[PDB]
Design a protein around this nucleic acid. Structure first.
Ligand SMILES: [Zn+2]
Ligand SMILES: [Zn+2]
Ligand SMILES: [Zn+2]
Ligand SMILES: [Zn+2]
Lengths: 71, 71
DNA sequence: CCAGAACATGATGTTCTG
DNA sequence: CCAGAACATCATGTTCTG
């Protein structure tokens, strides 16, 4: 049901974790990109259906803590 | 000469306030649309050149605080 | 059913026009 | 010099393809 990263409706088990489609592609793009992501807060942002756009640094961190992985 | 919103280099006085061009068009874009932004942190995100894209809500808030208006 | 590519959509920032 | 439109670009999200 619910994406474990952003709480939007999950679409299936992606990279070892139940996530939505946007989170699946975000994760792959993050790991495979150079990307210096910087939080504007305190490295603990709320990751929502909506707020997930705000902080890629916190979203990527939440992805890892959730267990996402490229095998 | 510094932008009062993000501390980047100001390009002139825009909508009543010394700002860079980035913040000038952002502000105009924000005041015109139906938007309703959400902060993922604690309504005090760091808005600088690097991080200004992270939180439109906090950025808009700094625009208003600095005194920006359509006149 | 899921990975990865592709195709839209966004928001953003610099250039152009009045 | 400034507002507002237009243009380029990039990050994100959905659909297509393997
Ligand atoms: Zn998600
Ligand atoms: Zn964050
Ligand atoms: Zn600025
Ligand atoms: Zn914020």
């Amino acid at each position: 049901k619910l994406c474990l990263v952003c709480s939007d409706e999950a679409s299936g088990c992606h990279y070892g974790v139940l996530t939505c489609g946007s989170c699946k592609v975000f994760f792959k793009r993050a790991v495979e990109g150079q990307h210096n992501y910087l939080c504007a807060g305190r490295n603990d942002c709320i990751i929502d259906k909506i707020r997930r756009k705000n902080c890629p640094a916190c979203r990527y961190r939440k992805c890892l803590q959730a267990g996402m992985n490229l095998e």
